[PDB]
Write a protein that binds this ligand. Structure first.
Ligand SMILES: Nc1nc2c(ncn2[C@@H]2O[C@H](COP(=O)(O)OP(=O)(O)NP(=O)(O)O)[C@@H](O)[C@H]2O)c(=O)[nH]1
Ligand SMILES: [Mg+2]
Lengths: 164, 530
């Protein structure tokens, strides 16, 4: 039973709160309410023969809650920075979170990068080749997730556990 | 729906509570005992915002001259100079009082003050308001009719007082007003409007008055005893609007020792609403917006105060007992860890007992000052203030506060301290969840994170974070039905049997801290005392 603290960061309306629902309860709501402050869950998965336990903190993405961030990642051993592929600016904001994570968070944190809403390739604005580049340059764990089709949701989380 | 406001000196007061109700207990209290209480509510302005008022026994009378909107100057003259003993009219020697004379002084009091309120109304009178003015005007005529037929003119309060001081004018009064029937009927047996001023006339008067001054008239409700049905009845402005005020007030104060029982509209027997001690409840209101007043006997008063001073001394003793244990469980005693407002006003009758035939003006003004000081002392317990905003959000329920996270104009300091509070609560509810499952593994982990929030994010002082953490520990210990304390007692005992320091040492210390210290503004360590 190795217990770790995880925190989802990113701009609002990217899919942070929905990824958690897909990762835990395996559901999805097209009309989800916005996260006020932060919600707390604990999900237990077992890689190989060893059990790990996540202390998940789904944060609020609005600009106001930015000052409350260090409370959420101070003891985090992992951080998922979620952006939208249908919004270039959300990805541009994710760059600031990572760069802020690198500055202020724990030096041994397993930062992950996620490009969500990947099912909306119709309105895709960010390029997968670009994000994969920026990630590989910044030592991140980049995938393309989709809480609407369960794509890479369980994959990105457990991929962090491998490094844990 | 409370808010938290930063004060001029960097502290955090919470929004003052608003009381819209007032209820007086049915007991062996005299009307003089409620004088200091009203004088206090006036001085602090707790009366103007009252919508409803209730009472039984002598309270039913006191709550009736409040609902009529009598000025606090007249009430002082009325309450101080009105011996009920004067208003006893036995049918003869060896008999109990009729209860007709006490009922008639009430009607005079009401008609004098309900008249001076109609004179303040602005003429003409609106169509849908045309009726209500007529009925009230008709009744006062009836009262002024009979009174003129007896040679008594009442347009002052002092006229009512000296009226009582003369049996001649008193018997004149009884012959006059008793003529007025209690129940008018006629084909087809339908009930006709009661010729006396009723509970509903209080509602009629108020609709007439401008919104500027509609606050002068309160919703009156009294409680009596039904000696036939052997239970309690409640007469209200809303429920029984056709019921005379002077009837139910005399009824509710008709002790079977001094007064003959009354006659219900069915003929059932009716007496004092406080033969046994009873606290009425105002229907349509919450508990936390109603001021409750109870008069206790002298011995009954001191007994309650002493058993409170005692359990507050033990709270400090048990802490020192734990610190002196170093170098018997925390259910001792009555430790309330969430904030609940105290609206209970206790009044010491003292020497004005029900046995005291006649009290000296010495021990009368004593019974007044007690009710004044005690009412003031209680109101001083509604003013919440804290040194740190998180302490307020933790001690007072976040369900009892206006959500600042949703508010876009809420100050950053309160908006941040609220997020700090929901994080701790998240952890608090997890420790409880896991301990009940049987997993006590991350208990220390979660508590370390809680303390970390208090000291890093909240940036509390080293001493005001002790109180904050202790409360967080006490609250979890409460929410887990003691599962935390027991587990904390094992770990520490399993660490002394290994000669090694433990983490459970400081957690148990705070767990045993006096609650009277953690919610205080005491700037010192746990040498709180009293
Ligand atoms: N197509 C698609 N829609 C998604 C995906 N993830 C989330 N959404 C949608 O995006 C909206 C926002 O979801 P939410 O998870 O609340 O975003 P958030 O980042 O948690 N917002 P906040 O942080 O302010 O609570 C919802 O309408 C949800 O259905 C995804 O992978 N694909
Ligand atoms: Mg969210």
């Amino acid at each position: 039973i190795c217990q770790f603290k995880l925190v989802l960061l990113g701009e609002s309306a990217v899919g942070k709160s929905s990824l958690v629902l897909r990762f835990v309860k395996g559901q999805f709501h097209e009309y989800q309410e916005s996260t006020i402050g932060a919600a707390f869950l604990t999900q237990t998965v077992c890689l190989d023969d060893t059990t790990v336990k996540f202390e998940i903190w789904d944060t609020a993405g609005l600009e106001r809650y930015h000052s409350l961030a260090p409370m959420y990642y101070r003891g985090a051993q992992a951080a998922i920075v979620v952006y939208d592929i249908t919004n270039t600016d959300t990805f541009a904001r994710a760059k600031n979170w990572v760069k802020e994570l690198q500055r202020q968070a724990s030096p041994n944190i397993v930062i992950a990068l996620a490009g969500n809403k990947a099912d909306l390739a119709s309105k895709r604005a960010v390029e997968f080749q670009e994000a994969q580049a920026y990630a590989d340059d910044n030592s991140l764990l980049f995938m393309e997730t989709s809480a609407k089709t369960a794509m890479n949701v369980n994959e990105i989380f457990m991929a962090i556990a491998k490094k844990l | 729906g409370s808010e938290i406001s930063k004060t001029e000196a960097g502290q955090y007061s919470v929004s003052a509570p608003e009381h819209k109700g007032l209820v007086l207990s049915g007991g062996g209290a005299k009307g003089i005992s409620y004088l200091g209480m009203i004088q206090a509510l006036q001085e602090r302005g707790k009366i103007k915002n009252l919508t409803h008022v209730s009472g039984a026994s002598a309270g039913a009378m006191t709550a009736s001259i409040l609902a009529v909107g009598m000025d606090i100057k007249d009430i002082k003259k009325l309450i101080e100079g009105l011996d009920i003993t004067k208003l006893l009219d036995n049918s003869g020697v060896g008999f109990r009082a009729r209860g007709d004379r006490f009922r008639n002084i009430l009607d005079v009091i009401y008609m004098m003050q309900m008249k001076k309120h109609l004179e303040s109304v602005q003429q003409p009178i609106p169509p849908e308001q045309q009726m209500n003015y007529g009925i009230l005007k008709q009744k006062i005529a009836l009262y002024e009719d009979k009174l003129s037929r007896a040679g008594i003119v009442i347009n002052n309060v002092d006229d009512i007082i000296n009226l009582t001081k003369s049996v001649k004018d008193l018997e004149k009064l009884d012959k006059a007003l008793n003529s007025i029937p209690t129940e008018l009927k006629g084909a087809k047996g339908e009930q006709l409007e009661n010729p006396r001023l009723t509970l509903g006339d209080l509602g009629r008067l108020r609709e007439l008055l401008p919104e500027e001054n509609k606050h002068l008239i309160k919703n009156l409700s009294v409680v009596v005893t039904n000696q036939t049905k052997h239970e309690l009845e409640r007469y209200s402005e809303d429920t029984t609007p056709q019921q005379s005020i002077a009837q139910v007030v005399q009824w509710s104060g008709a002790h079977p020792v001094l007064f003959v029982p009354g006659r219900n509209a069915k003929g059932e027997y009716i007496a004092d609403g406080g033969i046994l001690d009873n606290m009425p409840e105002i229907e349509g209101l919450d508990r936390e917006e109603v001021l409750c007043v109870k008069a206790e006997a002298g011995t009954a008063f001191e007994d309650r105060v002493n058993k409170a001073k005692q359990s507050a001394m033990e709270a400090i003793s048990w802490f020192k007992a734990r610190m002196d244990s170093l170098v018997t469980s925390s259910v001792l005693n009555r430790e309330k860890v969430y904030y609940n407002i105290d609206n209970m006003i206790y009044i010491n009758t003292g020497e004005v007992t029900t046995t005291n035939t006649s009290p000296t003006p010495e021990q009368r003004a004593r019974a007044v000052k007690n009710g004044y000081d005690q009412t003031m002392q209680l109101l001083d317990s509604h003013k919440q203030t804290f040194d740190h905003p998180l302490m307020a959000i933790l001690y007072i329920g976040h369900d009892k506060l206006k959500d600042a996270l949703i508010d876009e104009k809420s100050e950053k300091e309160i908006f941040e301290a609220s997020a700090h509070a929901q994080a701790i609560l998240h952890l608090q509810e997890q420790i409880v969840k896991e301990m009940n499952d049987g997993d006590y593994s991350s208990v220390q982990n979660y508590l370390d994170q809680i303390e970390d929030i208090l000291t890093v994010d909240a940036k509390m002082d080293d001493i005001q974070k002790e109180k904050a953490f202790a409360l967080c520990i006490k609250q979890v210990n409460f929410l887990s039905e003691g599962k935390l304390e027991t587990y904390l007692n094992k770990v520490e005992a399993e660490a002394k049997a290994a000669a090694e320091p433990s983490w459970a040492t400081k957690i148990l210390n705070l767990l045993w801290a006096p609650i009277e210290w953690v919610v205080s503004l005491f700037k010192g360590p746990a040498q709180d005392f009293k």
